[PDB]
């Protein structure tokens, strides 16, 4: 939920009340009675909690940030799942033994360099959540360095389909591709369904890019296509404008018609939101509020 | 921390003090007394004690 780990290190090892040992500029801010909200609040403390603050502010203490700088590292390693969460009580029990064994002027200044690049040079972790080359760009640029670029029929639409497929894994942060076994896959979401067999799809689409099929043929592709190729073309449909594969290829009978099939449900869901909200507006059997509703929409 | 600086006295108010009576006189069944409770000068009295 947080952005930075060192703020949680500054939340688990700093005093919540204002002390002059660490925040002098706020502890002296209220001794001299110069504060906007509640100014006159330090005279009326007795000699117990005046001298226990007014001595320690005009000459500060000299504490040791060794126990605090390591929590800005041990947290920064468990935020990125390098360590198990069940385990950080051991490594801080081992790093604090480490940097007190080999302590110097250098290591106290070398940890302090390392609690800055886990703050402002950990912006790469903010970066490839957006560009998602975790598993979407550099894991697919091996796939595009695997397919043959010499297709006999349809030389131009072959390199515009994968030009529209690299855009698919780029405009979606959740989708990713990977190497499992001798073939590459592609899931549209983490914790997600609809895994396409990406090797067994472009091998099915090879020798298929030029057909120029007529518009009176529907039930032939049970022995020609494969339903995951029929689902990969479903996942390429919203990111494919009308200028990719124009009109008369058999993919124009597929990719354009898949956008119309998505174009049905992206307005009939708004119809389905109306019907399920008027069954309780007039009084309708909720068991029979979905049987006849779906049959009108399928 | 049990506060100081104008919570308690600095100045020897007597903690409790015996009043003396004056003008007492009798009847065969009854009995009068009189006192001058002279709470005075920067002190209070609570009258339950």
């Amino acid at each position: 939920q947080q952005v930075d780990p060192a703020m949680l290190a500054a939340l688990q090892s700093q005093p919540s009340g204002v002390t002059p040992s660490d925040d002098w500029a706020a502890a002296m801010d209220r001794i001299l009675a110069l504060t906007t909200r509640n100014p006159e609040a330090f005279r009326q403390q007795p000699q117990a909690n005046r001298f226990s603050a007014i001595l320690e502010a005009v000459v500060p203490s000299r504490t040791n940030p060794t126990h605090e700088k390591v929590l800005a590292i041990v947290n920064a390693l468990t935020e990125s799942k390098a360590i198990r969460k069940d385990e950080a009580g051991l490594i801080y029990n081992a790093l604090l033994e480490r940097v007190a064994r080999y302590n110097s002027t250098n290591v106290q200044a070398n940890l302090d360099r390392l609690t800055t690049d886990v703050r402002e040079a950990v912006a790469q972790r903010e970066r490839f959540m957006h560009d998602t080359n975790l598993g979407s760009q550099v894991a697919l640029n091996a796939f595009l360095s695997t397919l043959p670029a010499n297709v006999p029929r349809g030389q131009e639409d072959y390199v515009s389909f994968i030009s529209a497929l690299r855009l698919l894994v780029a405009e979606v942060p959740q989708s990713e591709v990977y190497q499992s076994g001798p073939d590459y896959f592609f899931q549209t979401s983490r914790q997600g369904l609809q895994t396409v067999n990406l090797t067994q799809a472009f091998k099915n689409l090879q020798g298929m890019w030029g057909v120029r099929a007529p518009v009176g043929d529907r039930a032939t592709i049970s022995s020609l296509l494969t339903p995951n190729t029929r689902l990969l073309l479903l996942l390429i449909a919203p990111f494919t404008n009308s200028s990719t594969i124009s009109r008369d290829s058999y993919l124009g009978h597929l990719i354009t018609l898949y956008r119309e099939a998505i174009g049905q449900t992206q307005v009939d869901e708004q119809t389905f939101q109306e019907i399920t909200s008027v069954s309780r507006a007039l009084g309708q059997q909720d068991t029979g509020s979905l049987e006849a509703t779906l049959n009108f929409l399928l | 921390v049990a506060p100081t600086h104008d919570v308690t006295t600095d100045r020897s108010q007597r903690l409790t003090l015996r009043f003396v009576p004056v003008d007492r006189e009798d009847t065969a069944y009854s009995y009068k007394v009189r006192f001058t409770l002279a709470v005075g000068d920067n002190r209070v009295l609570d009258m339950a004690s």
Partner: peptide, 29 residues
């Protein structure tokens, strides 16, 4: 504020509840 009169638990003075200013002790009240 009158903070220099309350016996402070720490830095915060011990300021009581709001029923500690009056009383309503009648026979059946």
């Amino acid at each position: 504020n009158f903070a220099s009169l309350a016996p402070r638990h720490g830095s915060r003075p011990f300021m009581g509840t709001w029923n500690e200013i009056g009383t309503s002790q009648l026979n059946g009240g």
